[model samples]
Target chain A: ATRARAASNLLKALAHEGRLMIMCYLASGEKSVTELETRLSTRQAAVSQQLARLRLEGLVQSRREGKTIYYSLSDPRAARVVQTVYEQFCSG
Target chain B: ATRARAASNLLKALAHEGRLMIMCYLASGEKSVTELETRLSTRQAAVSQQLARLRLEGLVQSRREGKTIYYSLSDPRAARVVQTVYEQFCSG
Candidate 1:
């Protein structure tokens, strides 16, 4: 159950396209919500929605400076997983 | 759109706990439906159902030898991604 539980949790956290793209962006380094929106070319609301879910799932962490919020992968293990996913699917 | 589509497809293929556990098992090597069922302690119907989905998604391929069918990751990229997920969440 532990193995299934962990794998499922991680998979669910990364299972969305928007969240996957967010993880891909954060894997490289931290990025603001605005930066994520621009890179994803998705609306701010959509990007923020995915970010909110990621934050709730504890897959990502955020920092606030001024009125801007920057997000990054919260766990090293998750970062590795996201980087591997990007390399496998997004990289040529 | 292409990026999101591909990422979503791959993620959807792996989103379920049963499917994630199956991929974790297959990441090590090929497996039959019986082996997956035993490891998952899931009903044969459920295991077969997930396998059917995996096959349809082209995430896995099955070969028949006699009455037994062995399934393995169909795409090298997918295999790499599964291996990474196992390493990140299940390895240690």
Candidate 2:
């Protein structure tokens, strides 16, 4: 039951703030590039770069709908674990 | 909000095999130096060194009683999250 997230690759992928924000947004459910851009107030290019990193790390998955790509949490269990910790500790 | 583990320092501390093992063992409950030495079949000095690293990272805490020292998970919540992930993925 080796989860892929425990690997160094996952750690590196989630290590960045931008990517983490994207993950957080995804954690709420799937979203498209334009939605992330508007919510995070970040440029499309920056958001895409982080999404690319998360995709490679297997922490996220994407599918194309029309000309836009939608992303969501690939590892919900892991994300839930982290999101809880983040809310409990970091939110204080 | 930012967590300490997101930093390079905490990551480096938990990145090593010996340290991760120690954290896992500590997660079950507190254990003494002798307990760890026998369980993992590793030497005392190695165990002590990893414990020292954990202490420095605030990932563990220890106390002395008579002639022995007891170590335990300092960040039980974080440990739980990581341990769950490790068991779910790495145990296989």
Candidate 3:
């Protein structure tokens, strides 16, 4: 059965805690790796690893400006879904 | 810092195609295992396995009605998130 959809793909990409947090942060706007590290309070390797996975999954895209690489949700559906998750689960 | 919300856990639980489809269906309302089997066209064992995992994750809860068990989203946030995913990726 053709049960898979864009949503399932996005969900798989954002399934990790670091990746989900990164997507939630990127939901608002783009951020560099350093910025993501600070925002997520995660180690550089961990954030980079999640970013690589997200990039591979096409959930996020990165751009190089100067010495920094900024990443954001490349798929708009990811942005909307992450925002909705934030509103429903993260908001107090 | 660890994420305080259950959003990441829920995302992990629904990360797979079959699991995500199950959640999407439950978003509309509760469903019996037989109904999910028919709707998903998946093996009964696979659907039951996923349902067990969802139950353990607290994303869904089941109730007994006669000989059948009906499952529904236990966490309202999951339903809302699933609906948002559906709107963004499946509606079109």
Candidate 4:
């Protein structure tokens, strides 16, 4: 079924360390690429690569303001999954 | 960190149609391989293969009864993920 296929693909796209972390960060709201780089403790290339892949999957959306670009999760399902993962794995 | 990797792998393990369906079915409780086969509209070989993978990932536990084997989700985290997926994608 397309429902299963679509949902599975959503899970697949989120099944990555960087991407999942990005989603969790974005779950708070929008974030700039620079902010994400600091949070991920990496370079722009790596963060952009992960964000590009996330955007391709339609899991995240981006917008440019002035000189900085901000990204945020585009799907509530993805957000909920992020919340679940955090509760299960990241909560103190 | 290991947390991200572990959570991401858990998501990866659940990111498939058949396995996700199996996990959803087992979310209700336990089920025989035959029942999963019927639910998946496939056969034992396919069902067992999926179950074996789930077991290896520590996502599921199984027990044998007579000639039948019953499988169920062993992780509360996985159960929560399944419930979130259902509410977001499967619920009406």
Q: Pick the candidate with the highest lDDT.
A: 4
Give the lowest summed-lDDT range of ten residues in model 1 chain B: B1-10
Selected candidate, larger lDDT, 2 vs 3: 3
Best by the TM-score measure: 4
Alpha-carbon error at A74 in model 3, in Å? 1.7
lDDT of 1 at B90: 58
Candidate 1 local lDDT, A1-92, one digit each (tens): 57677767777778777788888889999898778887787788887788888889888999999999888888877788778778777666
Q: What is the DockQ score of candidate 1, to 2 decimals?
A: 0.62
> Can you tell me which runs of candidate 1 are displaced by over 4 Å?
none
Off by over 4 Å in 3: A1-6, A64-68, B64-68
Tens digits of per-residue lDDT, candidate 3, B1-92, equal 24424677778787788888889889889898779888886788888898888888888998999999898999887788888887677544
| lDDT comparison, 3 vs 4, better candidate | 4
Candidate 1 CAPRI category: medium
User: Which lDDT values do the candidates have, in the order given?
Assistant: 0.81, 0.66, 0.80, 0.84
lDDT of 4 at A54: 91
DockQ of 3: 0.56
Error of model 4, residue B3, in angstroms: 1.3
Ranking by TM-score: 4, 1, 3, 2
Which residue pairs in candidate 2 have backbone atoms (N, alpha carbon, C) closer than 3 angstroms, thus clashing?
A1-B89, A2-B89, A3-B89
For residues B1-92, write the lDDT of model 1, one tens digit per residue. Answer: 46656876787788788887887788888888768788887778888898888888888998888998898888777788778777777557
Residue A80, candidate 2: alpha-carbon lDDT: 65
Candidate 2 lands at a TM-score of 0.74
